Design a protein around this ligand. Structure first.
Ligand SMILES: [Cl-]
Ligand SMILES: [Cl-]
Ligand SMILES: [Cl-]
Ligand SMILES: [Cl-]
Ligand code: NA
Length: 129
């Protein structure tokens, strides 16, 4: 499913991502835009052999199991395919554990390079929340 900007913002707010660990809702919508283009079925291969999955491109090297990343961890205790669902519940709960691991939203390279230090509130402007 390809989410809409306000549709995703409302869905993320319902799952408690607004101001979660200090990151306003605009940060999560901005990151989802540049990580997956609002597409839940987005996948991308990394050089080390791991794969990024879902609306937030959560890495299989640490967070999910895809059966093809030897020596990796499954810290969110889920198959990586659950991150490709139209229900973002899995990706949000795993994102909450990622953003709490000490590095904040810097875990998402697209957020640090394209959202950090910008007016992220513009990503939720005009949305009914
Ligand atoms: Cl915001
Ligand atoms: Cl694996
Ligand atoms: Cl949903
Ligand atoms: Cl932080
Ligand atoms: Na894994």
């Amino acid at each position: 499913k390809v989410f809409g900007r306000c549709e995703l913002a409302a869905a993320m707010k319902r799952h408690g991502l607004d101001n979660y660990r200090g990151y306003s809702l605009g940060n999560w919508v901005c990151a989802a835009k540049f990580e997956s283009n609002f597409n839940t079925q987005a996948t991308n291969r990394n050089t080390d052999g791991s794969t990024d999955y879902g609306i937030l491109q959560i890495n299989s090297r640490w967070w999910c199991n895809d059966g093809r990343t030897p020596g990796s961890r499954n810290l969110c205790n889920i198959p990586c395919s659950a991150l490709l669902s139209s229900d973002i519940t899995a990706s949000v709960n795993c994102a909450k554990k990622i953003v709490s691991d000490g590095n904040g939203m810097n875990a998402w390279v697209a957020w640090r390079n394209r959202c950090k230090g910008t007016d992220v509130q513009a990503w939720i402007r005009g949305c009914r929340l």
